[PDB]
């Protein structure tokens, strides 16, 4: 089963954008497809739904009349068109997926879409060391600062380096642009013996920077 | 449109004791017809989509273990884990589907109770690359400690700072039911050479006193 999500990202009110999850390696027309969104921090709102053969559309109240969900089930794909965007739309936008009326219980493919409403303009990350000093347990980082909008992504060693890193919650400075770190705890015998790298990377910008942290 | 209501908000039970969550429809959700309980449970781990737990308000999904039950009947419906494990902490939704929209629960944020863990705390200074574009970041990280409540103070040559830092605080572990901290004191170039002493000076309940790290500008 592969799934490939796209659209979303920055878009300013008033405008559109347009949402697909495709897929292979189930029956795409042995389901009821669903779109569910999740402003960030808080919860889980039934969007819209559409039956195998597109036959019956529901949306809820929140999005009637400015939303369009539609399918193509040769394509294998599930499309949501969405027009006259307001600050609330902001969610994370995800793909679901129901059998029939003897078991309409959610089935999600496919990880969520970010979609950011607002006027501010796009900034790419500034990414800077925080550089390990001098039991012998020594913490590093990156501190990815003053960008927008959400999100970015912070691998270690291109993906090699997942055990001990805690990647931060991006928290909006007073500024208007976000700003998080990313840090790692390693045994301090291997601090010159092994090299570290923040792999930052922020789609809205197309900033891709991979930062090197050494100590001083 | 049917309306969700879960109780409680958020819950905090220890590691091998029961959780018990519960979930109100505003009409009841029982087909009188096929006599089934149109009501689904799912778990929604941190930057993940929501698994299903349990169906027909009773029938557990095949993988999810023993220890999760579903009840209820109408309108009262109760999500319950027996023993919880370390791997729980999520929130947790009550679903109706007798109508559609298929309307959600509010929510509920289930969190660990473990034995309390000191902070190991470290301190970074600015990095040359960031004094050049005119601003100073320090960063204090409180790394792997419970419980949540934690108070860090910034000094700046003994003079104690406020309303220039900002906190953020990971989602708790799956593993070791732990959190980390990182406060961010933000200054300007010119007050950052000013001074010269920078401590961050961390107060949590795994602690017999205040640990305080600190670095002199300039090693």
């Known amino acids: 089963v592969q799934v490939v999500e796209s659209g979303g990202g920055l878009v300013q009110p008033g405008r559109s954008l347009r949402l697909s999850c495709a897929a292979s390696?189930?029956?795409?027309?042995?389901?009821?497809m669903y779109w569910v969104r999740q402003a960030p921090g808080k919860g889980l709102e039934w969007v819209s739904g559409?039956?195998?053969?597109?036959?019956?559309?529901v949306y809820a109240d929140s999005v009637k009349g400015r939303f369009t969900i539609s399918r193509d089930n040769a394509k294998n794909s599930l499309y949501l068109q969405l027009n006259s965007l307001r600050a609330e739309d902001t969610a994370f936008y995800y793909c679901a997926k129901a059998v029939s009326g003897y078991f309409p219980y959610f089935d999600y493919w496919g990880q969520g879409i970010l979609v950011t409403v607002s006027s501010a303009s796009t900034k790419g990350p500034s990414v800077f060391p925080l550089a390990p000093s001098s039991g012998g347990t020594a913490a590093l980082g990156c501190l990815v600062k003053d960008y927008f909008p959400e999100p970015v992504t912070v691998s270690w060693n291109s993906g090699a380096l997942t055990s001990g890193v805690h990647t931060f919650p991006a928290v909006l400075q007073s500024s208007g642009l976000y700003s998080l770190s990313s840090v790692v705890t390693v045994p301090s015998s291997s601090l010159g013996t092994q090299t570290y790298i923040c792999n930052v990377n922020h789609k809205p910008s197309n900033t891709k920077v991979d930062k090197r942290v050494e100590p001083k | 449109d049917i309306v969700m209501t879960q109780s409680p908000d958020s819950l905090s039970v220890s590691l091998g004791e029961r959780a018990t969550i519960n979930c109100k429809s505003s009409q009841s959700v029982l087909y009188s017809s096929n006599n089934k309980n149109y009501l689904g449970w799912y778990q929604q781990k941190p930057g993940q989509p929501p698994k299903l737990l349990i169906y027909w308000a009773s029938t557990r999904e095949s993988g999810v273990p023993d220890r999760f039950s579903g009840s209820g009947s109408g309108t009262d419906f109760t999500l319950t884990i027996s023993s919880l494990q370390a791997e729980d902490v999520a929130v947790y939704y009550c679903?109706?589907?007798?109508?559609?929209?298929?309307?959600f629960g509010q929510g509920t944020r289930l969190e660990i109770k473990r034995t309390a863990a000191a902070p190991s705390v470290f301190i970074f200074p600015p990095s040359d690359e960031q004094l050049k574009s005119g601003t100073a970041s320090v960063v204090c990280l409180l790394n792997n400690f419970y419980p949540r409540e934690a108070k860090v103070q910034w000094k700046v040559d003994n003079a104690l700072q406020s309303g220039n830092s900002q906190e953020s605080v990971t989602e708790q572990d799956s593993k070791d039911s732990t959190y980390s901290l990182s406060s961010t004191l933000t200054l300007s170039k010119a007050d950052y050479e000013k001074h010269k002493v920078y401590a961050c000076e961390v107060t949590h309940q795994g602690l017999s006193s205040p640990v305080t790290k600190s670095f002199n500008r300039g090693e």
């Open positions: 559409i039956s195998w053969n597109s036959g019956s559309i």
């Open positions: 679903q109706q589907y007798y109508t559609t929209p298929s309307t």
């Open positions: 390696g189930f029956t795409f027309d042995d389901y009821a």
